[PDB]
Write a protein that binds this ligand. Structure first.
Ligand code: CLA
Ligand SMILES: CCCCCCCCCCCCCCCCCC(=O)OC[C@H](CO[C@@H]1O[C@H](CO)[C@H](O)[C@H](O)[C@H]1O)OC(=O)CCCCCCCCCCCCCCCCC
Ligand code: HEC
Ligand SMILES: CC1=C(/C=C/C(C)=C/C=C/C(C)=C/C=C/C=C(C)/C=C/C=C(C)/C=C/C2=C(C)CCCC2(C)C)C(C)(C)CCC1
Ligand SMILES: CC1=C(/C=C/C(C)=C/C=C/C(C)=C/C=C/C=C(C)/C=C/C=C(C)/C=C/C2=C(C)CCCC2(C)C)C(C)(C)CCC1
Lengths: 56, 97, 244, 56, 56, 137
């Protein structure tokens, strides 16, 4: 039932900070742009847009 | 099925006598003249296939063999229970006062 | 050039085995008439691998590499024993005493922690026959005992244990007991592990050998509550042969 | 009252099987702490049968 | 101490138990008073005592 | 209840002559036990070795028996392990090691009797509390 996970995987984001990848390979490092890092980036962006909405 | 082996061993002669293959060293205090010197030798040279094998420990004085002879009626031998001898537990089983 | 505790403390070198220089490609004669012993066997693990369990029965169940979470607490050191010279020319290390166990926790992808008692407790390890000199082709193959990761007094978070503790789930006073039996009955495992010490450097003068090891053993089973994993430990070793 | 009835039967020549088989199940059920109204919990919700089960 | 349990009346009438896990398990039930057989499956009974309507 | 003569009457030797201590003797013994021994033996236990307590039945099974006044006085002069096999004065306080245990220096025979009497009277007073540890607090 994964809906947004394939959209992340389609464009390059395949690893997790917890260590796995969607192709199932072992021991690769995703850097910041893991699935969690995408999700964190969208949350931070959501908050910054909220503040800009208040200002405007 | 699954059984508590420590609870089972209390159903044997371990629950009544000092077991020379299993019982913690501090239980040798219960009788005169075993602790510490003879108690140390008994635990060091365990296991035994019979109680009378305690007299075969190398280096015993004749007084030490006589003391052991007076206390064989308080000793027993069962199979070594690995849950009782591992972790150094025959020298310190985590019990104090 | 010999170091002190204040040089070593807090650097991580205390968890390291001593090394022999690259020049020490020599050979150590085993006089068959004279007895030998090991003054210090050090084992420093570098790589812990855990075998996965794919739920399929078949498939490729390979050893995956893990991340150590319990820090530089891993080496076995100060191990002593008698190095016998057998009839057929082989040398058998019988392990006597030392710091021969370390609890280690590594973590797989997904966050699963794997606790293991990394050990060589009661190691009997023998070489090949007709080895009149420990050279850089010597291989100590052998086996050891892996006792339970927790000992018998250990209490679970609900106060249940083997030699101590509750024998049931007291927070569920009227629950059915047979589904809780694997948690309520604590069981002390004792398993075997295999290790191969491969010599790479020999001090012909002093009697110091060093090399690599590979060790295979089961991890912790949580006193019988779950299945242990298969662990492969790799690393370096150091042994100093004193004649006795 | 359970012990009284058992001793009245045992004084009259009933065996121990016969004396205790004469105790009604309804009377033995009251002599069980899971029917005590002081064994519950503020957020242990629902019928008493949700706790120990339905007595058979 | 070689502890055994015998049941009189009820379902286990005449039966005697001597294996120490089985004897201990009925002893843990005997702290609650009279021992009853429960259906824990119909209601997904959690085994944890609840109060009565007298309590509520 | 009172601290009667019968409470204060303990064995003096291994044969069976008794000594009835005075209340002044028992109270002086408690003061000197607190002064010199209770840092390890508070309540009749032994903090640095909990296997060996000061209960009367335990001192009776010691070799030589320490369940009388003279046995305890000899132990305070020349302490042994529980079988009597080693002399442990170099790690246990005694008259013969008062140079390393300086609280033992100015102990008289009257002081050693008084401490020995306190060790014998106290379980007759406290019961299983003496030598029992925290379970009986
Ligand atoms: C006098 C009131 C009363 C009592 C004693 C009972 C008693 C019972 N009810 Mg009944 N019931 C009642 C009224 C009552 N009912 C009302 C008014 C309704 C309509 C909502 C119901 C609907 C109902 C249903 C649908 C069911 C019951 C059931 C039951 C049984 C189980 C109770 C339970 O688990 O509660 C649990 C109680 C709590 C968890 C306590 C609630 C605590 C509140 C939430 C805290 C409030 C804090 C407050 C907000 C803080 C304020 C701070 C502020 C002032 C600053 C018990 C026999 C059950 C049953 O077994 O029936 C067969 C069941 O299924 N009741
Ligand atoms: C208008 C809108 C009103 C909205 C309703 C608001 C719903 C939230 C109300 C709070 C929720 C109550 C928590 C109970 C949770 C629940 O699962 O219960 C569900 C329980 C029923 O219990 C259910 O029973 C089932 C079979 O009957 C099964 O056993 C289920 O397992 C069991 O959960 O229902 C009750 O709790 C309802 C009765 C409440 C009895 C009140 C007791 C009186 C308490 C007075 C205390 C007042 C203190 C005031 C302090 C100031
Ligand atoms: C700790 C530092 C102690 C102080 C101070 C005193 N004692 Fe002690 N006592 C101590 C130990 C560790 C032991 C056990 C020694 C061994 O056998 O390994 C003891 C033993 C005794 C005994 C024998 C008890 C028995 O069961 O037979 C006695 C009678 C005794 N000690 C008395 C005693 C007195 C009177 C002290 C005050 C002067 C005293 N001890 C000091 C530890 C320590
Ligand atoms: C229950 C359920 C579920 C879930 C759901 C969900 C999860 C939902 C959510 C949702 C959400 C979560 C939503 C939200 C929304 C929001 C909104 C709608 C908002 C709005 C806002 C606004 C209005 C703003 C305002 C402002 C401000 C604040 C400031 C500045 C300015 C302005 C004015 C703009 C499901 C389906 C699964 C199933 C069934 C059941
Ligand atoms: C470059 C880059 C990138 C991108 C980024 C981005 C996308 C950014 C964004 C940014 C943003 C998006 C920003 C924002 C900001 C905002 C702000 C700055 C706001 C503020 C506000 C305010 C100040 C307001 C205030 C207020 C309030 C709050 C309330 C009321 C009142 C007032 C109005 C005063 C990436 C990652 C891709 C990659 C790398 C590179």
């Amino acid at each position: 039932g994964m809906f947004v996970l394939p959209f992340m995987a389609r464009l390059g984001v395949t690893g997790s900070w917890s260590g796995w990848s969607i192709t199932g390979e072992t021991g690769i490092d995703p850097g910041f742009w893991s699935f969690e890092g995408v999700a964190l980036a969208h949350i931070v962006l959501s908050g910054l847009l909220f503040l800009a909405a208040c200002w405007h | 099925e699954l059984v508590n082996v420590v609870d089972e061993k209390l159903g044997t002669a371990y629950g009544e006598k000092i077991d020379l293959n299993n019982t913690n060293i501090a239980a040798f205090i219960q009788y005169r003249g075993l602790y510490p010197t003879l108690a140390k030798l008994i635990v060091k040279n365990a296991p035994y296939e019979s109680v009378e094998d305690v007299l075969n420990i190398p280096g015993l004085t004749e007084r030490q063999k006589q003391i052991l002879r007076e206390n064989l009626e308080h000793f027993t031998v069962t199979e070594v229970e690995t849950a009782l001898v591992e972790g150094g537990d025959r020298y310190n089983n985590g019990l104090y006062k | 050039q010999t170091l002190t505790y204040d040089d070593i403390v807090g650097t991580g070198l205390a968890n390291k085995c001593p090394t022999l220089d690259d020049t020490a490609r020599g050979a150590y004669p085993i006089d068959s008439s004279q007895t030998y012993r090991i003054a210090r066997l050090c084992l420093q693990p570098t790589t812990f691998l855990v075998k996965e369990e794919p739920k399929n029965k078949r498939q490729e169940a390979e050893f995956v590499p893990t991340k150590l979470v319990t820090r530089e607490t891993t080496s076995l050191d100060q191990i002593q024993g008698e190095l016998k010279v057998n009839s057929d020319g082989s040398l058998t290390f019988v392990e006597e005493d030392g710091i021969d166990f370390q609890p280690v926790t590594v973590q797989m992808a997904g966050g699963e922690r794997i606790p293991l008692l990394f050990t060589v407790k009661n190691l009997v390890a023998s070489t090949q026959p007709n080895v009149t000199s420990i050279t850089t082709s010597t291989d100590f193959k052998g086996e050891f005992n892996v006792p339970s990761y927790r000992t018998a007094n250990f209490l679970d978070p609900k106060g249940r244990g083997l030699a101590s503790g509750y024998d049931s789930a007291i927070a569920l006073p009227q629950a059915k007991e047979e589904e809780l039996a694997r948690a309520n009955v604590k069981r002390f495992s004792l398993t075997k592990g295999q290790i191969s010490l491969n010599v790479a450097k020999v001090d012909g003068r002093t009697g110091e050998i060093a090399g690599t090891f590979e060790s295979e053993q089961l991890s912790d089973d949580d006193m019988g509550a779950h299945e242990p994993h298969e662990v492969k430990i790799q690393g370096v070793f150091y042994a100093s042969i004193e004649p006795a | 009252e359970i012990n009284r009835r058992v001793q009245a039967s045992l004084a009259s020549g009933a065996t121990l099987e016969e004396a205790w088989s004469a105790i009604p199940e309804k009377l033995a059920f009251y002599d069980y702490i899971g029917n005590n109204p002081a064994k519950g919990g503020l957020f242990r919700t629902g019928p008493m049968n949700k706790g120990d089960g339905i007595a058979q | 101490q070689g502890v055994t349990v015998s049941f009189y009346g009820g379902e286990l009438n005449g039966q005697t138990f001597t294996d120490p896990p089985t004897v201990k398990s009925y002893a843990r039930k005997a702290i609650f008073g009279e021992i009853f057989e429960f259906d824990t499956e119909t209601l997904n009974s959690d085994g944890i005592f609840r109060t009565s309507p007298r309590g509520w | 209840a009172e601290l009667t003569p019968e409470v204060l009457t303990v064995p003096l030797n291994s044969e069976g002559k008794t000594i009835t201590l005075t209340e002044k003797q028992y109270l002086e013994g408690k003061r000197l036990f607190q002064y010199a021994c209770a840092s390890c033996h508070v309540g009749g236990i032994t903090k640095t070795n909990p296997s060996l307590d000061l209960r009367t039945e335990t001192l009776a099974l010691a070799t030589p028996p320490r369940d009388n006044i003279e046995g305890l006085v000899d132990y305070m002069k020349n302490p042994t392990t529980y079988d009597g096999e080693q002399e442990i004065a170099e790690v246990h306080p005694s008259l013969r090691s008062a140079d390393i245990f300086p609280k033992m220096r100015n102990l008289t025979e009257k002081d050693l009797v008084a401490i020995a009497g306190h060790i014998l009277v106290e379980p007759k007073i406290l019961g299983d509390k003496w030598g029992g540890g925290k379970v009986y607090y």
